[model samples]
Target: AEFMESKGEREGSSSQQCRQEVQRKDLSSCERYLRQSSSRRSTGEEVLRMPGDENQQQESQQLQQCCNQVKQVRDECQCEAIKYIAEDQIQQGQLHGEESERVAQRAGEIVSSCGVRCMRQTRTN
Candidate 1:
């Protein structure tokens, strides 16, 4: 899941962090996933502590962080952010056709999977 930097900073009286009313940090799942999952495994650690256990810990931590953000945003706001993210991916050719719905559904799953009650989206596509 590649992501674009949310351009435009706010110095005025508005409440938006970026033009989209969401910050990159609030929506960057791939960035956090890659850093926590791929970057921490090292050959040097395999000779000492239980590498497999350490990997699970890293993954759990990643989910914890993701859940924190999920809990931070209002349900409607989270849906809006998810919608924008899916559209961006489609526009960037990262997903085609109905695959955007797959991305959107998975994001909703994360919310439910993390114990947050999923909000019913008014529009059914």
Candidate 2:
């Protein structure tokens, strides 16, 4: 006797799959950028103007790669992707209240950098 198993091909909102996508992606650099204590901040155009320094250019390249990953996750979950990562960081104690807020603010700039438009949700409670 042979048994056949049937699986439904439901193509609705795969929120779980979306979460899986977020979980599987390596966002270490994204996390590191948030946790950094460095006070340097500038727009991409501003950074592009000062490309004479090799060290600065390397950091910018890493930041750009991190932002690219942000863009990908944003594609899957819009603003929720950034929100999720920050939440996880806070939960893990890698970010405190003020640090979390700082990350939130930086996240806004990153969304702009990635060229994705969405109403940023801030939990400044």
Top candidate, metric TM-score: 2
Clashes of 1: 0
**Candidate 1 Cα errors over 4 Å, as ranges:** 1-21, 30-59, 74-76, 114-125
Q: Mind giving the per-residue lDDT tens digits that candidate 2 earns over 1-125?
A: 99989886766333556555664442333554555654244433423433323222434554564454544553545444554555566677556746767766665554444413332542221
Instruction: Write candidate 1's Cα lDDT for 75-101 as tens digits.
Output: 444555444543455566456656655
> Where does candidate 1 have its weakest 10-residue lDDT segment?
39-48
Candidate that would win on lDDT: 2
- Please list the C-alpha lDDT of all candidates, in the order they appear: 0.42, 0.48
Model 1 per-residue lDDT at 25: 32
How large an RMSD does model 1 have?
Answer: 12.8
TM-score to native of every candidate shown: 0.43, 0.49
**Residue pairs in collision within model 2:** none
